[PDB]
Design a protein around this ligand. Structure first.
Ligand code: GKT
Length: 142
């Protein structure tokens, strides 16, 4: 009476040099996201994604209750960004935290376009959460 369900999350970011006045201080535009692979719908099992920005940002706790799960910002430095993916789960685990390396392109390097692929293994999900994981394009491994 085991079942294991695997789902994939993609965390990623894009960064490039910003174009505004010498006197506006942000050197970069960036974008950070959480998504499913092609033809998966992670909204079936994801309640919300919380992006914890550097304390220097206004409202550093950025919440996406629905897709797209992303933050678009301007900034002057990279930082380590905690990213919490909350589940539509009534038991443990209720969420996963990732520590995301939000690094910028320095000294005339090309734009950054990074992806981090995370495989989540749910052991013995409740019947309802199992269904959500599968609706999202999750796979039974037993
Ligand atoms: C280690 C470190 C890393 C990043 C920052 C940073 O970029 N801070 C920062 C602080 C305030 C900001 N405000 C913006 C602009 N957004 C525009 C859209 C919503 C309002 C703020 N970008 C901002 C960026 C500061 C440090 I020291």
């Amino acid at each position: 009476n085991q079942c294991t369900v695997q789902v994939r999350l993609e965390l990623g970011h894009r960064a490039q040099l910003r174009k505004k006045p010498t006197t506006e201080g942000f050197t970069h535009d960036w974008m950070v996201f959480v998504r499913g692979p092609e033809q998966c719908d992670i909204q079936h099992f994801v309640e919300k994604v919380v992006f914890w920005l550097h304390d220097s940002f206004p409202k550093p706790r950025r919440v996406c209750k629905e897709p797209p799960y992303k933050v678009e910002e301007s900034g002057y430095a990279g930082f380590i960004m905690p990213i919490e993916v909350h589940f539509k789960n009534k038991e443990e685990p209720r969420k996963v935290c990732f520590t995301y390396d939000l690094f910028l392109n320095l000294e005339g390097n090309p734009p950054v376009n990074h992806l981090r692929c995370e495989k989540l293994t749910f052991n013995n999900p409740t019947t309802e959460f199992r269904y959500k994981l599968l609706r999202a394009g999750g796979v039974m491994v037993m």
